[PDB]
């Protein structure tokens, strides 16, 4: 439970490319393209939208945890 939380924080830093605390659509596109994952731009924007509960266009750490620690 403790190292899972640390793992989730590590996973958040993978996508929060600039480390401001928010995963943007551009950052997710950059990270997906760099890692060789094959997702279209529409799929990336939809990932951000799905995890964006507040509606700011970005994914904060709280929403990232909500998405990772899910049913």
């Amino acid at each position: 439970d403790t190292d899972s939380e640390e793992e989730i924080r590590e996973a958040f830093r993978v996508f929060d490319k600039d480390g401001n605390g928010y995963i943007s659509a551009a950052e997710l596109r950059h990270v997906m393209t760099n890692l060789g994952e094959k997702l279209t731009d529409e799929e990336v924007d939809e990932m951000i939208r799905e995890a964006d509960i507040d509606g700011d266009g970005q994914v904060n750490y709280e929403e990232f945890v909500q998405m990772m620690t899910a049913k």
């Binding site: 830093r13 480390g19 943007s24 060789g36 924007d45 799905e50 266009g57 990772m68």
Partner: protein
């Protein structure tokens, strides 16, 4: 509550776990650890947060630009609880090669964070490709001699591309639309108060941007003010992203319009396609002269110097005159006059005076070497511009209108010599600040004789000759004052017969 992409996130997390460190062969973990204080900034709240960080920085730079040199760095995260140096992230630490003031670093951080806010605002309009400006912070190495400051940012992997500069450069090779549309969007959405240019980075992850502001007082020495805006709009060819967000095109001359339209075929072959979810462009302003004169009229408070777009056009005029848009070639005078006309219609007093002098076939300062063709329409236009400038507070134009109503010099053919109006303008000039006694004596002469609507007034003629004599004094013109006193006595002598 439902998440249908969790496995995409997790597959990416696993791919990263087995991804090699691009800087492994530089052995930064073997560098003696140094201690630093990190200042990070929030631009919405305008607030600074500081913390203590541990860094391992390369001893020699990997690249240098014009102003700064860059060092590879590893830094331990304070978001993680117990990160080891084997997993520390990669960072670029930039330092000014020439020593600068300590506030320059914080001002650059504010610049970058404001550009990031503008990128987010652009993203909120659902563009085909979203943008993001990398956060930049400061690290202070208080144990090094001098306690040096470094800018710190995350290292972006990929092809670093400069899409545009802060001085009209545009990357036409494999042209992209998002950077230029973003810059134009920042110009319009800010109400012409700023423009975010110098777009560069990896894909749409931008860093080292530049902001041109209306006042030009903030954001360092790269802020060329309205001139910088002009440099953008001299080269910007609006693309389909500009049009999908309702951005009005900048009014360019035919020569410039063709020079920027020459790449419309490449603009049509761009890969960035619109979806239709793009919304239309804190109070935004359009970039067209017609909509701007409509807005300025909607102000109703009849004004001058109330449009930044006019100042941009004036900057274009001065750039044309200075040789900024021509090569080792005669500079384009027709387009300079085009932008001067636009600046004048937008309430730039300098432009109005310039065009009044040019259409009146008179000597002028701005575009001095340009002489316009002489027509009757041009004479009427010159007098109208001079009268508008006179009512707007220009003393030279007030004296010229006074002389036009007095002698007829430079008077429009549709008007008539009116000595009461000439007296009005002479006095408006005298109450503002060629010498005073000359104009006072001219008024005195006009009232001594009368004519052109003005009735002979010996009393006021003598009073004004007395004022001119007192003004010849305070200028070391004794004999002139004596002659003016004599002329005052002459004017008064007519009232006793």
């Amino acid at each position: 509550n439902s998440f249908h992409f969790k496995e995409a996130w997790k597959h990416a997390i696993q791919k990263a776990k087995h991804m090699p460190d691009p800087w492994a062969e530089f052995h930064l973990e073997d560098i003696a650890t140094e201690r630093a204080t990190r200042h990070r900034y929030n631009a919405v709240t305008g607030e600074w947060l500081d913390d203590e960080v541990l860094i391992k920085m390369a001893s020699q730079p990997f690249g240098r630009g014009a102003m700064r040199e860059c060092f590879r760095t590893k830094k331990l995260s304070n978001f993680l609880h117990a990160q080891q140096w084997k997993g520390a992230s990669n960072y670029v630490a930039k330092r000014y090669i020439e020593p600068v003031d300590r506030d320059v670093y914080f001002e650059d951080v504010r610049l970058q964070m404001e550009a990031k806010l503008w990128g987010e605002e652009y993203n909120r309009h659902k563009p085909p490709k979203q943008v993001d400006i990398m956060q930049m912070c400061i690290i202070e190495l208080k144990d090094r001699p001098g306690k040096p400051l470094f800018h710190l940012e995350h290292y972006i992997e990929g092809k670093y591309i400069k899409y545009n500069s802060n001085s009209g450069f545009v990357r036409d090779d494999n042209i992209r639309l998002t950077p230029q549309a973003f810059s134009h969007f920042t110009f319009e959405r800010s109400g012409h108060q700023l423009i975010v240019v110098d777009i560069q980075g990896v894909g749409d992850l931008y860093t080292d941007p530049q902001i041109h502001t209306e006042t030009g007082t903030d954001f360092g020495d790269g802020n060329l003010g309205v001139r910088g805006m002009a440099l953008f709009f001299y080269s910007h060819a609006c693309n389909r992203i500009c049009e999908s967000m309702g951005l009005a095109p900048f009014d360019l001359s035919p020569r410039e319009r063709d020079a920027v339209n020459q790449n419309t075929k490449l603009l049509q072959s761009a890969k960035t396609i619109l979806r239709g979810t793009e919304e239309k462009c804190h109070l935004p302003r359009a970039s067209a002269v017609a909509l701007e004169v409509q807005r300025l009229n909607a102000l109703d408070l009849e004004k001058i110097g109330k449009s930044i777009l006019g100042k941009v056009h004036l900057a274009m005029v001065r750039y044309h005159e200075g040789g900024r848009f021509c090569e080792k070639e005669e500079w384009d005078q027709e387009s300079a006059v085009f932008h001067l006309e636009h600046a004048a219609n937008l309430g730039e007093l300098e432009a109005i005076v310039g065009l009044g002098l040019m259409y009146s076939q008179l000597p002028h300062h701005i575009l001095a070497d340009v002489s316009l063709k002489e027509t009757e329409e041009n004479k009427t236009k010159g007098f109208d511009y001079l009268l508008k400038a006179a009512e707007a507070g220009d003393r030279q134009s007030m004296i010229l209108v006074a002389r036009a109503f007095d002698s007829g010099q430079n008077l429009s053919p549709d008007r008539c010599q009116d000595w009461l109006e000439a007296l009005h303008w002479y006095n408006t000039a005298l109450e503002m600040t060629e010498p005073r006694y000359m104009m006072l004596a001219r008024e005195a002469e006009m009232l001594f004789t009368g004519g052109y609507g003005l009735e002979k007034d010996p009393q006021r003629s003598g009073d004004l000759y007395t004022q001119a004599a007192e003004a010849a004094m305070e200028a070391m013109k004794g004999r002139l004052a004596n002659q003016y006193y004599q002329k005052a006595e002459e004017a008064w002598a007519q009232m006793e017969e």
